[model samples]
Target: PWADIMQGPSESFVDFANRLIKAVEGSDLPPSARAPVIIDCFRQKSQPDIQQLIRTAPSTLTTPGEIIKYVLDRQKTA
Candidate 1:
């Protein structure tokens, strides 16, 4: 059912994805757009636990790979 909502013959996830991704391409966006939309997703959603850890505790992660793995692992729980 969820898949159906995102995908069908006339209105589909493919169409939605194409439109969304293409919109990010500067030239493809509508003309006379003075500024880009202000998406404050990261600013709005502040995870207190994550911030506390980042602030008070030293990271166990040493490299970017470790950080990516940590995020993937944490995301599973989220």
Candidate 2:
């Protein structure tokens, strides 16, 4: 189950690891990140959630001012 679900991408794993490293280096990661956070995010455990968040999570602004206003109203209630 884990193998099927967590199979590495078809592309070169080295390239994937390198890009993840570059993304981490460019981001505002903390000192504690000097240990595990960067590596952890690159792993299968976190990548699915991260990708899902990016894929399914609502866009910041899809339509116009109305969608923004609705989201802001919900944020206030949330």
Candidate 3:
């Protein structure tokens, strides 16, 4: 099953991403399809801020690595 998929109030985006990624890291998923599915597994309501950024993010930030970087950058600028 997916990880908790809820971003804990005290957790960072990286923390949330790591858990999500860790769960599927062994799924034999290829790199190209990894990030998209990981985000698809998150609880939409649990990550309000993150969800906003992801929704508005440029389509180019489609990879898991880029999405993680974007989340980290957004958090830094907040």
Candidate 4:
């Protein structure tokens, strides 16, 4: 489950997010618990560059799916 979310940096964030939601939708955890679990999954699978971006924008991590969007947007200009 967690392995699926650990896509390459070049992959589409939208696709990743959708896949993540689907992966966890059938889990025992509720909606509120899923985001944090997803984030943790990301934390584990993220590459070094992605991890650095995450560290740089710690504030955005507060939202469930925002980090993926934030990283994707950042990559567009980078």
Residue-level lDDT of model 2, residues 6-58, one tens digit each, is 31444333344445556656667675563364434434432453334323436
lDDT of 4 by residue, 19-75 (tens): 777887767787788778888766666666766777788475776568777877785
Over 1-78, each residue of candidate 3 has an lDDT whose tens digit, in order, gives 454467877777777777778877767678677666775764262377777877777765656777777767776453
TM-score of each: 0.25, 0.39, 0.69, 0.66
* Candidate lDDT (C-alpha), each: 0.32, 0.40, 0.69, 0.70
Candidate with the greatest TM-score versus the true structure: 3
The backbone clash count of each candidate, in order, is 0, 0, 0, 0
Q: Any residue pairs clashing in model 2, and if so which?
A: none
Please say which candidate is ahead in lDDT: 1 or 4: 4
Model 2 RMSD vs true structure: 14.3
Put down candidate 1 lDDT per residue, 2-78, tens digits, no spaces.
11122123443234434433443344435433122211111122244433432342455543234334444453232
Q: What RMSD does each model have against the real structure? A: 11.6, 14.3, 3.2, 2.8
Give the RMSD in angstroms, all C-alphas superposed, for model 1.
11.6
Provide the clash count, candidate 4. 0
